[model samples]
Target: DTERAEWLNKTVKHMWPFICQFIEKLFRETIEPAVRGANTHLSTFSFTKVDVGQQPLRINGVKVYTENVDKRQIILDLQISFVGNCEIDLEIKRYFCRAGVKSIQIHGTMRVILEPLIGDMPLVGALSIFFLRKPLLEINWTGLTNLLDVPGLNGLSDTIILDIISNYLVLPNRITVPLVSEVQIAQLRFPVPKGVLRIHFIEAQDLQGKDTYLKGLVKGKSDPYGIIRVGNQIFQSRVIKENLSPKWNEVYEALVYEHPGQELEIELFDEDPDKDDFLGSLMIDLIEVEKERLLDEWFTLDEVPKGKLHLRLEWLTLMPNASNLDKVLTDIGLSSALLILYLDSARNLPSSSNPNPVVQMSVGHKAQESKIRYKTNEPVWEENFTFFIHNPKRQDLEVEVRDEQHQCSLGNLKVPLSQLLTSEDMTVSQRFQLSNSGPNSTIKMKIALRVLHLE
Candidate 1:
């Protein structure tokens, strides 16, 4: 029982103070400030009354109440008032308390009028108008001469016709005319020939219904006449034909027969009255017409005498009774030096019938001084010798050597010899030897040699 009392006391102490402080602060701070400000401006406000009885009302289902009573019909009516300090209007609604006391809802419609706290005091009313006025149209005809000197045209000619193909020409912000309308030409001297220069026009139209018009004139003989137009409307002038030579004759009497310099003018126009016109012009001189050479003689390498000599040496060994030496010699000339020794008997000696003889040939400065050593196992009727060659030069070289022997008896007939040597003058040297082995034998030999390069 004591615990229950203590719990009830603690709960009430905390809850009561919290509820009281919240309600008190809300009314004193928030509601009081709004009510005070509204009252101060009450004189400037106008009020309107509203009667809620005009609108139909609907009933909501009831909830359980502590005091039970019989079901009863309910009637409701509301009256409200509004204040409009500014042009804006306000709407108000009303409600009834549970005690059947009615209260009017007050709504204020006063909008604050904003004024510029800074900047030009005199322009306060129409500030936007001062900033939004139509921009001024700027027309510049200066430096028109520079525009006329653009690269395409050779020189200006008299009586130039510019065909205007459209009505909307966009005037360049910085320059008066678009770059396509600018006619450039090289300068010419006085007395330019009279010629009719025709300017063709091309039309390009964009999505917007704007028209661009172009016109050009040639003052000197060599200048080109160019024109471009955009939009739907087109104006093609009748062919303009003017005698520039005559005009130059009248301007400068002595220059009638001579070349004369002339000035050109170009104009771009648009139908829009708000848009400004674009104008460009240039001046150039004309010179006497000379035949231009379109082709020149072709260039060729100069035929200066160059000295070169090619020498080839090929050797073939032939006995007095041999059939052919020409083929062997030709073969030696074409064969590589490494395979030359195998083809010639001079390098590859013949074998004997009984005991074979070995012949060794050493190459030295002297011819016979270089010894040819012979060895025999028993005896030989004939013998064969071969040489392994060495090269002394770094360059690739060809060598041919051959040996022939004529012996009618023992079926030993003379034979042609041919050998090829490669990589001559290299580091390695070659050794040749011959051997004869037989009961009794006599051998005679002749050698021929040469060296050459293959084609």
Candidate 2:
């Protein structure tokens, strides 16, 4: 493993100078114009001098994904770091303001995707480049904006700059460059996830209640809640008051586009009026979840004295047919079909002021609500949900898209579960028209039903 980094570092060192030249050119042309267009005040901004410095970018580690990838594409991850003594100068002609970067440093894991392997001269037809997460960025400033170096304001200023960088290089905001023509890059640009992860947030026991009153003499029970995250998708469980052992049987499903380096993060907190108190946290490797397919276990909390979390995890694979439906039902011994629904997104929602949208779906008496997407009309919720169908022909899946902030209905849809039986592969995916919302508002969903039979 160390040898891989050594050879890769050697190769990069050899090509460092030429790479610097290419990057300098990019900074002047692409970045300069982008910066100018970002703000009206920076419209007259220009890069005076651009240098990538003498220090070469170093590769600390390399990981090539061997599983859960298409045969026509290759995925490689590089843990990279760059500490440059480079000088980059910029000037705004309108305000006569001058500022430049004195030194820069960045550390991150960069993902490189070479896809659509062709039989021609260059084997790979295109390349997609992006960071797995936000990089550690530090910049030394000079001239007018050097006030950003103040300790009290460094965090805010650096965050502003990072937000600018995130717009282009972050996950979901990738850079796809074509290496060869006649290739359909649309699919490569927006790749579908390999599978979905359904998390059963069952319960927790013996949690440390971080609540006190009467000058710490008396202890009070806490209103504890959990925050679960996978990459950028986040879900929060309802808070339960005055309980050390709390039961929150909530289900949340997240799309797993890349699992090798991703993690399922969970943190419990005591809700309070002023601020929240940290209870405990847990992080699990998603690759293990993918391998296990199904996991039901109790895990001890990390960075705490005593606490245990009960979780049930499932990896749901999209099936094109009902071939394995009976066997899946046999394993669970459930006398019914499995109803899987992918709540994709919604568009052209009725105009509103800061609508915090959440979708609620239910079959019979069992109901589930998705995580809230704040302050958006057209919300993209790439979440998966499942319901057990005792009788498909008799049940109806009822959906309601509502604004949590306004406490008003935005849209709603109702579908008979029997509609899936006659569809192709027992699956139906489309944008269904909303009933009570704007005329053009629609919700996109991919629903499938799998019948259970005695095998």
Candidate 3:
């Protein structure tokens, strides 16, 4: 373990001086002008001193992604920690106001991507850098005009700066540097989302009645509402008054850039004059929801007890073909069939040194992966997956078991959809033999196909 960390730290130590100078230059040349031009009030704003730090940034570990990535690009995840004993000052020429930061700290994983590995001198067409999530950041302020010390101003200033940073450095927002002339830099600058998620906020039941009467002797019904969020997009449902079972049928659609780490977050509240009371909350993994394509179910709320929420979610895939463009305009006619898979479990998996196994299932272009079962040959993954099929007669369900640690295939299976057509109730459940693995290795699953007929 030290062998990997040793070389990285040594190389960073050697380049610390140059890196510090580069950052100072960046602040002075790039950020300073941008801040000055940002507002009419800040027209006289300028940095009096720019200093990165006396300490060098350290790397905890590095991860090279081998799965779920493009072959034409190389991706690296660096776990970094930087605590700087630095001095940076700024002043306003108009009012002679002065302020500065005495110290700064940042901790998070940073992603570096080298895309279009070229055969030219640089061997890479461009470099894209971003953080998968918001990093832990802190800044210590000093000087005469230190309004940032105020409660409201402190969080306000910090959030503003974080927003500015996230606009350029967070997922869906990255800094791209061109290394070759022939590269189309515009393509790298704009990020296309994976898909869109349409959510139906149906209703909730048995909510906590926050309003009280006669010094808590009598309980009153709550005026409950919900706030839903996916990344930066947020939607709030209308309040339903004086009822335990309240219904507010609302729909919202959100663009999904990265589904693997995102979640559909919902929070319920009782609206009051000054503040809102917390009712309950729920978070669903977008990755699982995307696999199902359509989900209509009741979910138990988390955090508080005695409440349930009903929601319907749909994952809409964007098509680029013009001939089938009318499919987007029409409903019910969009899908001809629906396929469902009940992944029961896997047993006797092949492992030489104890593999961390996960299952990958797909039909056509859409794919879904199961959770990893560490240090086990037998994994129980009782999960359900659904797919919207345009033509099931020709499609096949492909399944693969992989070692998450080594990124190697352990076993695979393929079943034709035509087989399900002849089965009773159009369903089949059995243990299927795994190929390219231990002879005894097998996976059990229930597969069903339903023909969608318009009445």
What overall lDDT, based on C-alpha atoms, would model 2 receive against the true structure? 0.78
Model 1 Cα lDDT, one tens digit per residue, 329-349? 444302222211111123233
lDDT of 2 by residue, 1-455 (tens): 42257877888889989988978887887778887887676688788998878888898888887877765689988898999788889777776667888898899888999976754556788899899888888777776355344332344565687666655668676767788775343223333456667789999998873343351345466778999999988999999998879999988877667546899999998875334377889999998888888899999998777789999988777554566655655565122566778887898888737588899999988899999998888887767676756666678999999998889999899999778877897889899999989989999998887654322
The best candidate by lDDT is 2
lDDT of each candidate versus the true structure: 0.23, 0.78, 0.75
* All candidates: TM-score: 0.11, 0.39, 0.37
Q: Which candidate tops TM-score?
A: 2
User: Each prediction's Cα RMSD?
Assistant: 51.9, 22.0, 26.9
Clash pairs, candidate 2, are none
Candidate 3, which segments miss by more than 4 Å at Cα?
Answer: 1-4, 144-168, 171-173, 183-455
Candidate 2: which stretches are off by over 4 Å? Answer: 1-192, 209-219, 273-276, 326-455
- Quickly count the clashes in candidate 1: 60
Model 1 regions more than 4 Å off: 1-356, 364-378, 381-442
Give the distance in Å from residue 104's predicted Cα in candidate 2 to where it truly belongs: 52
